[PDB]
Design a protein around this ligand. Sequence first.
Ligand code: NA
Ligand code: NA
Length: 327
Amino acid sequence: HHHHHHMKKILLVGAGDSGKSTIFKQMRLIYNNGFTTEEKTKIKPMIYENILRNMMVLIQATKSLNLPISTEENRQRAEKIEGLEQKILLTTDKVWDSNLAQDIAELWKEPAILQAMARRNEFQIEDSASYYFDNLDRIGKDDYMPSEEDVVRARIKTTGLIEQPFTFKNLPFCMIDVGGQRTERKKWIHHFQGVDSILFVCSLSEFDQKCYEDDSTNRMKESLSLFGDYINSKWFADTLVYLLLNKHDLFVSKIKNGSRLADTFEEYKGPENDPDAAKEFIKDMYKEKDTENRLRDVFFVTALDKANLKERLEQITSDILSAENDL
Ligand code: NA
Ligand code: NA
């Protein structure tokens, strides 16, 4: 008769800018489940709105920093972009055209904008902002269709259930990213919602960022607090929990470029411009929150590096399998 064989489901858990959605999208690519023409068509205006919002944030940042724009032409261009961004949630019109793409590319050369961008950790700017700005020659074309990498880098909030099944060492698995309202059980693979493992994803690179524009709370301090609450309160039943410290390579660049961990965490006494000492301190802070040692393991990862993510996920799935027969 109709029947199933147990699939080991791995649930992605994390904040909205943890990069957990990057992990899921990379898994889609690893398992030949890439983005269709319809998907790319639908995501295209969202990429436009991402780019417009990032430039708006930079314009506002020059005002906060008291940095005058170099020319009246770029000042009027900035005012135009401000007006269009402020209209985005209040219209159904297509705001993006070739004129706007050219205006944003010109503003990306403005010294006041670039000074704000050098201080981007202080502002609410997407990680992918410079990527999109630097590729505006391609993205601003009338014939533009988002690339694979464009989609991976676009932070789109999950509002339903998505699953990526796969086979590893001849056994079935799937990775889950789920949000929004309750998704009916019939939509799940095997119409089954049980979770064998949790990947708790935290950003390593957020140590020098604020939670919101109008709040002083540090993102990493908040994530440590939330992780502490989660790992000590959940009944995990039979579920294995892994901590993934993501955006590792971005963290490394921040440390190498002079953003000091000690400016956020005064207890960090390690060397300056030393990413390995700094990331070990962060890993230790997370493990300290895990009072009863409920974590199975802790991994550093850069989800945007598909080869690195593959390697770390293979380590995780191998370890899940090794624990299956634990007595
Ligand atoms: Na069977
Ligand atoms: Na069934």
